[PDB]
Amino acid sequence: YGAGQIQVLEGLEAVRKRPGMYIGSTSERGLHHLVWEIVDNSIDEALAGYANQIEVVIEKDNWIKVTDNGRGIPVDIQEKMGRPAVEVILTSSVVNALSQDLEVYVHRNETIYHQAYKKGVPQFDLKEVGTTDKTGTVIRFKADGEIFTETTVYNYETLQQRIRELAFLNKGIQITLRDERDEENVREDSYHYE
Ligand SMILES: Cc1[nH]c(C(=O)NC2CCN(c3ncccc3[N+](=O)[O-])CC2)cc1Br
Numbered sequence: 001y002g003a004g005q006i007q008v009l010e011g012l013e014a015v016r017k018r019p020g021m022y023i024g025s026t027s028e029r030g031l032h033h034l035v036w037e038i039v040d041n042s043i044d045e046a047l048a049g050y051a052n053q054i055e056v057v058i059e060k061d062n063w064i065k066v067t068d069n070g071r072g073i074p075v076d077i078q079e080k081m082g083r084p085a086v087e088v089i090l091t092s093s094v095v096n097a098l099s100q101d102l103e104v105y106v107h108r109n110e111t112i113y114h115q116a117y118k119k120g121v122p123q124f125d126l127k128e129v130g131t132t133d134k135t136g137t138v139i140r141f142k143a144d145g146e147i148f149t150e151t152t153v154y155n156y157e158t159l160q161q162r163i164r165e166l167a168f169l170n171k172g173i174q175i176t177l178r179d180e181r182d183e184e185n186v187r188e189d190s191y192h193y194e
Pocket residue numbers: 038039041042045066067068070071072073074137138139
């Protein structure tokens with residue numbers, strides 16, 4: 001209703017109108033860029049000194065799940081928007097705007113908080129769903145086929161090459177890639193340079 005929500009909605013419209021100006025293209029390259037946008041957040045949180053494990057999973061139907069053991073995206077009610085910080089951050093995310101569905105689970109304050117979105121729009125208010133003794137952020141997203149019209153299927157080797165490189169370039173971070181798309185044949189590569 002307020003000036004805040006208005007700018008968020010205009011922001012989503014702008015990203016979906018010209019996706020290639022935000023992520024380079026809507027080809028297979030652009031699809032893979034979505035993963036790097038999320039993963040780069042976890043890398044920064046590790047470099048800041050608050051995380052050291054990152055897991056990227058290619059799930060059934062080419063959902064992507066990214067999990068870190070950082071502090072967790074904050075959930076406190078923000079001054080600007082009057083909404084949880086996590087909601088504000090994710091409603092301005094290009095990955096969220098270009099995903100048909102996105103989910104977040106924040107582990108923080110010994111609590112698990114959950115919110116879901118479609119094309120960047122929150123589907124309900126941030127909800128406490130359980131408790132935890134760890135901190136971290138889990139992001140699950142499904143790329144929007146309306147945007148990524150060529151393909152929404154990830155290439156394991158493409159993710160693997162860059163994930164390995166990230167681990168090599170950011171020594172000490174454990175980065176794991178797992179492909180669960182075929183439950184009968186699951187592949188996993190784990191990188192941890194010392
Ligand atoms: C997958 C993933 N991980 C993160 C992440 O770790 N974000 C950090 C950003 C800094 N955070 C903060 N922590 C404490 C106070 C204020 C903060 N902040 O400014 O967001 C913790 C989460 C964002 C996303 Br997608």
